[PDB]
Amino acid sequence: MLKQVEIFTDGSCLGNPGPGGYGAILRYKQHEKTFSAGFHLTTNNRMELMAAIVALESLKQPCEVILSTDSQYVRQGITQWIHNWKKRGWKTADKKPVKNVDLWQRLDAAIQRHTINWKWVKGHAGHPENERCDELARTAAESPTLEDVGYQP
């Protein structure tokens, strides 16, 4: 692809666990799309992941993608754990499913589809789209419309 899809994502909750939401912005060929939804009861980690998942799932055909997020959880999973989670059949040694397996498997399916370059950002200052996503995540959390069916403590 001569030109790559740019994605920016964030998610958060109002207290953790609590109502939560995500925001994602995609830009390709100078066309921008936004996604945002709120959940009645969820976690920060689940919303940070959901933001990336929904953005990537919106690209139905394989794309070369640059995805910018300040999520530590997403970075940790992508850079440290997900190779091994998959190899272990998505279970820990006690044979329990890994935490947030539902969302990590959806992210893994998106990683199979797309050629993603991850940009782990720090701070909103040089990152206007990420700041917009932070606001979207909050306003969604202030007006949820979905149950997070995979949130299962």
Residue numbers in the entry: 1 to 153
Which of the paper's sentences describe this entry?
In this study, we traced the evolutionary and mechanistic origins of the thermodynamic differences between mesophilic and thermophilic ribonuclease H1 (RNH) proteins. We then reconstructed ancestral proteins along the evolutionary lineages that connect ecRNH and ttRNH.
The other resurrected sequences are evolutionary intermediates at successive phylogenetic nodes along the lineage from Anc1 to ecRNH (AncA through AncD) and from Anc1 to ttRNH (Anc2 and Anc3). Our first goal was to verify that the reconstructed ancestral proteins behaved like members of the RNH family by characterizing their structural and functional properties. Using far-UV CD, we found that all ancestors are folded at 25°C and exhibit secondary structure consistent with extant RNHs. We determined the crystal structure of one representative ancestor, AncC, at 1.3 Å resolution and found that it adopts the canonical RNH fold, superimposing with the ecRNH structure with average Cα RMSD of 0.8 Å and with the ttRNH structure with an average Cα RMSD of 1.3 Å. Finally, we assayed the reconstructed ancestral proteins for their ability to degrade RNA:DNA hybrids using a simple hyperchromic assay to follow RNA cleavage and nucleotide release: all ancestors were active at 25°C, demonstrating that they are all functional ribonucleases H. The temperature-induced unfolding of ancestors along the mesophilic lineage becomes irreversible starting with AncB and continuing through AncC, AncD, and ecRNH. For these proteins, the unfolding curve does not reflect a strictly equilibrium process, so the midpoint of the unfolding curve is therefore only an apparent Tm.
